[PDB]
Structure formats: structure tokens, C-alpha cells
């Protein structure tokens, strides 16, 4: 038959990469719009301020 | 101060001449005749035969009518009778040194499987042992370098789990049966 590539190690990581992509995208699907994280405060200024 | 073994030894020796014609021809003849894998096996058989010959020579150089000479000599003769490389006619200490690598090589389990008629070739005997088909005194053996004793020769038969001697058929039989069921509908 002819379904995958000529080797096996080349196609071994593709299933893992697409599983990582789908589990990332699902992690962007069910999100919470209430009780969020904390913002980041960024303090800037000049010398001797 | 951990409690371990820390006891090991090397069972084979390497000759000082790596490239000679007659030596390589002799080990190649032995390996191809008796179906062995590499020269480490015949090197280890040479090593244990040299150890037995050295022990017999050390007993022969000690004087006659001494209890240690008789004890270790009769122990060595009873042991080598139990292996089967000697008979009761040649039950003598000086007859130990007239042995050969051939006599130690006939007592291999692979040679006995090929010789009795379980297998068709010596390599087929080796791969038949490797797939767990040969048992002796109700215990399966998966290794070809098994030394059978003289009393253990008549117990050689096929296993109760191998399909060759009666049991569950293997992977290709059930797959071909399922293929026949699929073809028949």
C-alpha cells in the first residue's frame, strides 16, 4: 500500500505535532471570560526620578 | 558497603595469532558444520577444554596413591561420564587428555535436536530452539548451548504449548483462517 512516507521516523512526530496543535486549539476553545489572570505592571522612568 | 556479588570471570580466550590460514579454516569448518553463531562460542569451548586438560595434567603430575589425586580424579571422571563425552571403558585419568573439541561439541542440545530427528538442519534446530518448541523433563528450553546429560537424552520431545507437538496454532494459522473466512464471506 501507499499511505505514509517512505520511512517511519519521519511520520512518527507528525501525529504528535498535530495532536499538540489540536490540544492547543481546544485549549483556545473552552476559555473563561470571568476571574481572569493578573495584569503586568511596567515601571519606566529617567535617572534620579 | 552495599551487599552485592562483585564476582565475575571471562569464559573465553583470544588467540595470540589473529591472522593464520589453518586456524581460521578450522574454526570456520567447526562453525559451518555445527551451525554456531560466532567464534566466541568455539573460543569458550577451547577455554573450558583447556581448563579441564590443565586440571587433569595437574592431577597427573602428583604422585600415585594419594587421597587428593583419587578424589579429584574420580570426581572429574564421574563428571565427564555424566556429560557423556566418555564411556566406562575409558575410565582413566590419562585418557582425559586424548579428548577433542568434537566430543564437547556433540553434547550440545542443538546437535541432539538435529541428530535425533526433530529438525532437518542444524540451523533449523537452532531457530527451532529459539522459538520455544523443544522441552525436556517437563521444562521448555529456549537456548541452544544447553548441555544434556546421558540420562537426559531419552526425554527429548516437543512441547505441550508448541503447535508442532500439539497445542494452540500460531499467528499465521489463525490469520490465514480469518482470511479464509473473509474470502468465503
Amino acid at each position: 500500500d501507499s499511505d505514509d512516507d517512505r520511512t517511519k521516523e519521519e511520520r512518527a512526530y507528525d501525529k504528535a505535532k498535530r495532536r499538540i496543535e489540536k490540544r492547543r486549539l481546544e485549549h483556545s476553545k473552552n476559555v473563561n471570560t470571568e476571574k481572569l489572570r493578573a495584569p503586568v505592571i511596567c515601571v519606566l522612568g529617567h535617572v534620579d526620578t | 558497603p552495599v551487599a552485592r556479588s562483585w564476582v565475575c570471570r571471562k569464559t573465553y580466550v583470544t588467540p595470540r595469532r589473529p591472522f593464520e590460514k589453518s586456524r581460521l579454516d578450522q574454526e570456520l569448518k567447526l562453525i559451518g558444520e555445527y551451525g554456531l553463531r560466532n567464534k566466541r562460542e568455539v573460543w569458550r569451548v577451547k577455554f573450558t577444554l583447556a581448563k579441564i586438560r590443565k586440571a587433569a595434567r595437574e592431577l597427573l603430575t602428583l604422585d600415585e596413591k594419594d587421597p587428593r589425586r583419587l578424589f579429584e580424579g574420580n570426581a572429574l571422571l564421574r563428571r565427564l561420564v555424566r556429560i557423556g563425552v566418555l564411556d566406562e571403558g575409558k575410565m582413566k585419568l590419562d585418557y582425559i587428555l586424548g579428548l577433542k573439541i568434537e566430543d564437547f561439541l556433540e553434547r550440545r542440545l542443538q546437535t541432539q535436536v538435529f541428530k535425533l530427528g526433530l529438525a532437518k538442519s542444524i540451523h533449523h534446530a537452532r531457530v527451532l530452539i529459539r522459538q520455544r518448541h523443544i522441552r525436556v523433563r517437563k521444562q521448555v528450553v529456549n537456548i541452544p548451548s544447553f548441555i544434556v546429560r546421558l540420562d537426559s537424552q531419552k526425554h527429548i520431545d516437543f512441547s505441550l504449548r508448541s503447535p508442532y507437538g500439539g497445542g494452540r496454532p500460531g499467528r499465521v494459522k489463525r490469520k490465514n483462517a480469518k482470511k479464509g473466512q473473509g474470502g468465503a464471506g
Partner: protein
């Protein structure tokens, strides 16, 4: 703690394993000496410290990834290498010059930018205390144009044996915790030379 992490560095990405989560007290900051706590799990929006075993080289300001799977072969980080190939503002030009040393990455970046605007190449970018090896590489650079045969150490203390092997043969170390005082000492030595 039971995970495999990847952090980018000087020689591409370096894969390591996490060891401890050192957290400062909430009343205090990260710049405290020898007073932290150990945790198994850390919650989001927190400033934590990661401990590793063999990383030694890390370009900060870059993402990291955590894999729950078995990462048996580095092919999974092709997108990280692709991200590293773009936005390289701090190009690590490795030439033959002054062996410079600093305690932090930002101090090292500021010092190499000062050498860049001072039009002097730099050789070594080691981070940490000054040892015998850095002074020895300065002694190597004491041949083949010995002008750049000094060790620039900022906000760090040197070892005593390094000082002894330094002044046994004449290697100058301008160790100063004040960066503009270090600049003035360096340009004074340059003018004297």
C-alpha cells in the same frame, strides 16, 4: 516538576529538566539573598525562578514549551528554531578581542554594546565569577595584538587564585561594581596604553 522543558541559548536551543521552583516572599522581591521557598506547583501570573543542571547559556526574552509526551528526538522544536531565526537584534558576533565578564545577561549586553560603540571587538561572553580559565584566555590574547589582553569584570568578585595567576604575569582586571567608573578606568588604561 515531572516534565521536559526547552530553553533557547547561544548554541541554539538547549533542552533541560526542571529542578526546583524558587519563589520569593510576596512581601519582598527577587533581589534577596538566600531566602526563598520550594514548591511543587505554581499558579499563573507569578514570577518564579527555574533551576536547571546543564544550561549555562541562555538568551532571554524567548518562549519555552512543555511536553507531556516522550520527546525522544529534537524535531519537535522546529517552530522554536524558526522563531529563533527571525528577530535577532542582538547578533552574537564572536571575534578575537576583550574577554568581558558580567554577573547578569543585561549587564553583559550593556557591556558588549559599550564595546561596540567604543569600536573594540570582544572574545569571551562568560557569565559568573572570574576564574582561572577567563584570566588564562586573557593570557592567550596577550599574544597576537596584546592591546586587548584585559578582563572586564562588572558587579562581581574575582577569585584569589585568579588574581595570583593574573599578577604573576601581568593581566589587568578592571573589577568595578560601578559601570561608569569601570568605563572611566577602561578609557584611562586605553589612553595610557
Amino acid at each position: 516538576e515531572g516534565d521536559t522543558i526547552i530553553v533557547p541559548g547561544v548554541e541554539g536551543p538547549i533542552v533541560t529538566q526542571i529542578r526546583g521552583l524558587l519563589l520569593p516572599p510576596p512581601m519582598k522581591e527577587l533581589r534577596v539573598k538566600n531566602q526563598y521557598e520550594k514548591h511543587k506547583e505554581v499558579e499563573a501570573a507569578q514570577g518564579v525562578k527555574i533551576l536547571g543542571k546543564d544550561l549555562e547559556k541562555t538568551l532571554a526574552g524567548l518562549p519555552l514549551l512543555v511536553a507531556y509526551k516522550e520527546d525522544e528526538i529534537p524535531v519537535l522544536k522546529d517552530e522554536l528554531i524558526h522563531e529563533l531565526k527571525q528577530t535577532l537584534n542582538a547578533i552574537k558576533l564572536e571575534e578575537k578581542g576583550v574577554y568581558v565578564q558580567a554577573s547578569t545577561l543585561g549587564s553583559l549586553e550593556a557591556l558588549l554594546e559599550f564595546l561596540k560603540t567604543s569600536e573594540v571587538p570582544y572574545a569571551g561572553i562568560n557569565i559568573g565569577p572570574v576564574h582561572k580559565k577567563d584570566v588564562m584566555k586573557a593570557s592567550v590574547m596577550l599574544e597576537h595584538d596584546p592591546q586587548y589582553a584585559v578582563i572586564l569584570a562588572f558587579d562581581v568578585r574575582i577569585e584569589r587564585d585568579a588574581q595570583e595567576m593574573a599578577d604573576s604575569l601581568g593581566v589587568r582586571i578592571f573589577s568595578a561594581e560601578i559601570i561608569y567608573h569601570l568605563f572611566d578606568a577602561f578609557t584611562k588604561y586605553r589612553q595610557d596604553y
